[PDB]
Amino acid sequence: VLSEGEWQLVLHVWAKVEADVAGHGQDIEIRLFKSHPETLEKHDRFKHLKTEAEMKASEDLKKHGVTVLTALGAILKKKGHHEAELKPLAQSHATKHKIPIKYLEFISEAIIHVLHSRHPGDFGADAQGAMNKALELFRKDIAAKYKELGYQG
Ligand code: HEM
């Protein structure tokens, strides 16, 4: 459980993410793939990318980065009450794309890193703690859906 203050901290930083969703999305994907290159293999449309030049030029890479942040945005704005949002996400990512909870932990790390990198003036220990809690809640709830779908996990 996050307090109302923690949720507002999250949403306040998220407003900044949504002020440049394209740049943030590119940054999180590039960071994810550089830190954990095996995750790129899951993306058949752009698993060919190797160089950062290629990554920055990829429309497909940017599109997933933007969709991640936009989806997460809608989820976070529900402040925990995100069952309806998580349902389709767990469905596709468990049964179609086959994305392990481990990879959602990786992309969560990438998000935290990029927030810290782009917003060092606002994103201190308090905001990072709150963002970590919100992402942890998301991961726990999606993991429970993964199990329900038989996807381990
Ligand atoms: C906060 C975490 C994430 C969110 C909110 C998210 C959201 C989405 C959405 C909305 C789509 C399009 C509709 C759909 O298929 O469900 C999609 C597609 C897809 N996703 Fe994610 N995703 C997340 C994490 C990741 C990760 C970590 C992987 C791979 C490591 C990935 C792999 C894919 C693939 C392969 C597709 C299909 C087409 C494409 O490449 O865009 N997802 N995701």
Quickly tell me which residue has 């381990």 as its tokens.
Answer: 152
Alpha helices in 44-124 (DSSP H): 52-57, 59-77, 83-91, 101-118
Quickly tell me which residue has 């507002």 as its tokens.
Answer: 8
139: Cα within 13 Å, side-chain hemisphere = 18
- Whether the Cβ atoms of residue 95 and residue 151 lie closer than 8 Å to each other: yes
Name the token pair of 11.
């949403």
Question: What is the rounded CA–CA span in Å between residue 135 and residue 10?
Answer: 10
The verdict on whether omega for the bond into residue 5 sits within 30 degrees of 0, i.e. cis, is no
Q: How far is the CA of 89 from the centre of ligand 1 (A)?
A: 8
Say if domain 1-153 classifies as CATH 3.20.20.450. Answer: no
Helix (H, G, I), strand (E, B), or coil: what is residue 44? coil
Where in the chain are the domains? 1-153
Ligand 1: atom nearest CA of 92 is 16
Name the token pair of 30.
């590039």
- Of 44, 55, 64, best ligand 1 pocket probe by most atoms within 8 Å of the beta carbon: 64
User: What's the CA dihedral at 89, 105, 67, 128 to 10 degrees?
Assistant: 120
- Among residues 104, 103, 105, 101, which one has the least CA distance to residue 152? 101
Break-preceding residues in the chain (C–N over 2.5 Å) = none
Question: What is the rounded CA–CA span in Å between residue 145 and residue 91?
Answer: 8
Name the token pair of 6.
């923690």
Helices (H) and strands (E) in the chain, counts: 7, 0
One-letter amino acid identity for 121?
A: G
Nearest-CA residue for ligand 1 atom 38 is 43
DSSP per-residue codes, 20-39: SHHHHHHHHHHHHHHH-GGG
Whether the CB of 67 sits within 6 Å of ligand 1: yes
Please give the resolution of this entry in Å, rounded to 1 decimal: 1.9
Q: How many CB atoms lie within 10 A of CB 23?
A: 15
Q: How many CB atoms lie within 10 A of CB 113?
A: 15
Burial of 80 (0-12, 13-18, 19+ CB in 10 A): middle
- Whether the Cβ atoms of residue 135 and residue 108 lie closer than 8 Å to each other: yes
Q: How far is the CA of 3 from the centre of ligand 1 (A)?
A: 29
Name the token pair of 100.
């392990």
